[PDB]
Amino acid sequence: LHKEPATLIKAIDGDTVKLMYKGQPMTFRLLLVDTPETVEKYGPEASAFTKKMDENAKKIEVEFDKGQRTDKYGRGLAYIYADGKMVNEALVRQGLAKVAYVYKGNNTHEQLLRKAEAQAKKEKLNIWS
Numbered sequence: 174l175h176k177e178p179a180t181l182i183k184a185i186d187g188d189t190v191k192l193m194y195k196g197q198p199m200t201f202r203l204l205l206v207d208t209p210e211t212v213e214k215y216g217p218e219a220s221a222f223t224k225k226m227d228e229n230a231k232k233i234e235v236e237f238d239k240g241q242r243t244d245k246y247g248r249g250l251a252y253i254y255a256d257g258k259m260v261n262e263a264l265v266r267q268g269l270a271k272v273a274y275v276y277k278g279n280n281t282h283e284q285l286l287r288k289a290e291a292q293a294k295k296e297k298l299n300i301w302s
């Protein structure tokens with residue numbers, strides 16, 4: 174697995190972001206996470222979190238997993254990093270997303286995310302409150 178450079182184009186919601194990747198604009202769906210739909214409880218919160226984390230980043234990186242790189246809707250499936258920090262992981266650690274959708278052999282960071290979820294649950298953060 175390797176991180177690749179990308180440019181923030183526009184926020185979409187908690188687990189989806191529009192990024193310029195290799196000179197082409199595309200929507201990226203964050204791997205292994207499920208944020209509330211924007212409405213569901215904490216949906217706006219999750220959206221604001223991702224939007225802020227991504228926009229404040231000096232450097233945005235995309236990291237594809239070992240399996241399929243795009244879903245049926247043409248969205249890139251990856252782990253997004255903002256200044257070295259994984260957005261997927263931070264959302265789950267903040268209790269603003271649950272671990273979900275383990276598909277197409279893309280589960281490299283599943284355990285790391287499961288640990289963040291357990292901690293957020295233990296702390297009764299947001300979704301787990």
Ligand SMILES: Cc1cn([C@H]2C[C@H](OP(=O)(O)O)[C@@H](COP(=O)(O)O)O2)c(=O)[nH]c1=O
Nearest residue numbers: 189202203204205206207244245250274276
């Ligand atoms: C995270 C992820 C979602 N998806 C699909 C499953 C869902 O399809 P359906 O439309 O059948 O529900 C959809 C959920 O995306 P959102 O959570 O953005 O709605 O994206 C994948 O196929 N692979 C993945 O790795």
